[PDB]
């Protein structure tokens, strides 16, 4: 297991392989964090989050 096959490339959400390296991305309503891996919500009710 390598790149995206290895724990989702350490990405919070979407993982793709571009030129043999991990590229992370996020669903609409999230911004990719400075680390290029985490996904940070832009508002109070981001998609896919339980309201707890």
């Amino acid at each position: 297991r390598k790149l995206c096959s290895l724990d989702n490339g350490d990405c919070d959400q979407f993982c793709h392989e571009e030129q043999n390296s991990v590229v992370c991305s996020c669903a609409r309503g999230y911004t990719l964090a400075d680390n290029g891996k985490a996904c940070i919500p832009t508002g109070p009710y981001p998609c896919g989050k339980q309201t707890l």
Binding site: C4, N8, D12, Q13, F14, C15, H16, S25, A27, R28, C39, P44, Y45, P46, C47, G48, K49, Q50, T51, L52
Partner: protein, 230 residues
């Protein structure tokens, strides 16, 4: 939903309920955004005029939205139940709040490789709690394992197309049921829930050697994206 558990506060905020003129629920849907609901194309034959309710977990205690545009897949047919998908644009936007929030739409390749390969998904709705019974007054959810495609085809009396997938149990008495159609099948990945299926059809509910059949959302991501732009 047969078996499973009650959706507790905030646990299933993407659930939508399609209600007829008599304000009775007949099908589910999934909230995609403030203006859009995902449902099954077959649900659009179950009532002439309908509205969408969001935020309710208990149908016996007290937002209702009218539908502006109904977008049904033009290839859906009752003969095969293939292409069982529709998108609804609402007249007014949904206000997100506790118990009202959209499910995420995943990117296609990643969903196929990472979500559909997970052990389980979650189905939810206000459908019957037994094959013979009344609609549930409480929103319910159920963890359903993904079923191997070969096993799925073997067990079925009808053709399972590439726009469908199987989920549930062989003999364990848990499944979606009547009234749950059109509702969400979501898959959790790192505490984020992505829409992966639409409740479509089944040979009864929780029957031995039968599984629940769901519309494969990954097969329609481009179609959904286009439908959300007019």
């Amino acid at each position: 939903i047969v078996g499973g558990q009650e959706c507790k506060d905030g646990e299933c905020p993407w659930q939508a309920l399609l209600i007829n003129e008599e304000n009775e629920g007949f099908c589910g849907g999934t909230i995609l955004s403030e203006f859009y609901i995902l449902t099954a194309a077959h649900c659009l034959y179950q009532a002439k005029r309908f509205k969408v309710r969001v935020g309710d977990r208990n149908t016996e205690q007290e937002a209702v939205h009218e539908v502006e545009v109904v977008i049904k897949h033009n290839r859906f047919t009752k003969e095969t139940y293939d292409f069982d998908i529709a998108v609804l644009r609402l007249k007014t936007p949904i206000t997100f709040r506790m118990n009202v929030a959209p499910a995420c739409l995943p990117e296609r390749d990643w969903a196929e490789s990472t979500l559909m390969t997970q052990k389980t998904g979650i189905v939810s709705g206000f459908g019957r709690t037994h094959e013979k019974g009344r609609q549930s007054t409480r929103l319910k959810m159920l963890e359903v394992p993904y079923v191997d495609r070969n096993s799925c085809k073997l067990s079925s009396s009808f053709i399972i197309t590439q726009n469908m997938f199987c989920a549930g149990y062989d003999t364990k008495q848990e499944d979606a049921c009547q009234g749950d159609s059109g509702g969400p099948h979501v898959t959790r990945f790192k505490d984020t829930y992505f829409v992966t299926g639409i409740v479509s059809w089944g040979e009864g509910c929780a029957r031995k050697g039968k599984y629940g059949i769901y519309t494969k959302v990954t097969a329609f991501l481009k179609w959904i994206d286009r439908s959300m732009k007019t």
